[PDB]
């Protein structure tokens, strides 16, 4: 959807990335999404498991906590709108859309990785 690419280009300010965000600040983040990526890729049906719903809730927990730690993490998590998309994934109970979100976050990660000091 590459709107992530557009926002990342809009976030290279005069240089800094998201005003002090580094890819290693994202460690716990992509680790959680990849762990969920595995547990979901194992599943068969698109109808999500309900401990999987619990795991998505726990992921939102990690989001709110990372945002609490750092201001740059807060800015990143707010502008690029992780938060409504997680909410709608929780509301939808669809696996394929979960992987769509996964590729979304991975796109953010890769593009930022190439877009650095």
């Amino acid at each position: 959807m590459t709107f992530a690419h557009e926002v990342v280009k809009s976030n290279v300010k005069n240089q800094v990335l998201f005003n002090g965000l580094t890819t290693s600040k994202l460690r716990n983040l992509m680790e959680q999404v990849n762990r969920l990526y595995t547990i979901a890729f194992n599943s068969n049906e698109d109808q999500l498991n309900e401990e999987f719903i619990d795991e998505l809730e726990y992921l939102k927990i990690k989001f709110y906590y990372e945002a609490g730690r750092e201001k740059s993490v807060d800015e990143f998590l707010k502008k690029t709108l992780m938060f409504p998309i997680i909410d709608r994934v929780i509301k939808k109970e669809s696996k394929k859309f979960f992987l769509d979100y996964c590729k979304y976050f991975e796109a953010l990660v890769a593009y930022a990785k190439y877009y650095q000091k």
Binding site: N28, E51, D54, E57, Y58, I61, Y64, Y65, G68, R69
Partner: protein, 302 residues
């Protein structure tokens, strides 16, 4: 051929899995010195069956930023969860800003990887034979993974920077307890590097390690406390090796100094650049006032 190898853990052993446990899933008990890992499924199912999930959410989701109110025990106590109930929601326990977890198997039991055990063996063999084609003589040496290790031999330990003046490091690592006996099977495809050959080689590495580096930390309270308690004069006849993390780089003084400067340039340039204009790893047990160094254990063949 094939041989069974026993491992007796003299001190804390760490094999990093890369999981740094965060401000969650533990209860650090200041007054009793135990940290309680919490099962995710049972805890959240308790949150759901008592309709405390919603309150727990807003508690965690609003970080009070108050250091006394940024744990899990305070969150549980604010909901007045019984101590008997709380103790049941504990998956497993060990005697903490973060916590680095060990490697665990498919059933979350801990085992020694074949990589780390062989990796330390390779570090020893390279030194003894100055890398006498040791890269080629891998493919004909085979190490099997250890058998599982029950939880009862796991504990928390702080990393201490043991110099002439001791300093405490901020972070904690999980380790296998003292005197734990560990099994694994060895396979030999080349008779040239026989079993006695391996034992003598690693012993010689230990002796060179002593007369280069382990004599230097004397006059330190903990240092002489550890070295004498471990009996390192007799250990020169004993078969000892540092495994995985927690061991210094050294596992002439001028070349060592230059190499250390280059390594620290590559490592700490992002946090402490003081090296460019310029330290032993140990664990001190509050229970016993006994400091151990992380890594060493006896190895015996059969």
């Amino acid at each position: 051929k094939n041989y069974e190898v026993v491992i007796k853990t003299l001190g804390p052993i760490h094999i990093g899995s890369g999981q740094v446990m965060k401000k969650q899933d533990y209860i650090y008990d200041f007054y009793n010195s135990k940290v309680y890992m919490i099962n995710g499924n049972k805890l959240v199912k308790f949150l759901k069956r008592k309709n405390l999930l919603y309150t727990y959410q807003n508690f965690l989701r609003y970080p009070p930023k108050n250091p006394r109110e940024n744990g899990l025990k305070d969150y549980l106590d604010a909901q007045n969860v019984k101590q008997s109930e709380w103790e049941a929601f504990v998956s497993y326990s060990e005697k903490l800003n973060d916590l680095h977890l060990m490697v665990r198997d498919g059933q979350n039991k801990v085992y020694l990887p074949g990589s780390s055990i062989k990796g330390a063996i390779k570090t020893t063999l390279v030194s003894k034979y100055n890398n006498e084609k040791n890269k080629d003589i891998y493919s004909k040496i085979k190490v099997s993974d250890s058998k599982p290790i029950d939880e009862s031999n796991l504990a928390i330990y702080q990393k201490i920077d043991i110099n002439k003046s001791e300093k405490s490091m901020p972070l904690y690592r999980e380790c296998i307890d003292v005197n734990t006996e560990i099994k694994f099977k060895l396979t030999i495809e080349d008779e040239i590097y026989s079993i006695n050959e391996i034992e003598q080689s690693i012993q010689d590495f230990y002796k060179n390690y002593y007369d280069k580096w382990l004599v230097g930390f004397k006059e330190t309270k903990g240092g002489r406390r550890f070295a004498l308690e471990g009996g390192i004069p007799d250990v020169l006849n004993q078969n000892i090796l540092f495994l995985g993390a927690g061991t210094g780089f050294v596992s002439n003084r001028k070349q060592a100094k230059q190499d250390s400067f280059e390594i620290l340039t590559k490592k700490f340039r992002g946090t402490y650049g003081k090296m460019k204009e310029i330290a032993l790893k140990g664990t001190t047990n509050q229970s016993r006032h006994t400091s151990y160094q992380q890594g060493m254990c006896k190895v015996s063949f059969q």
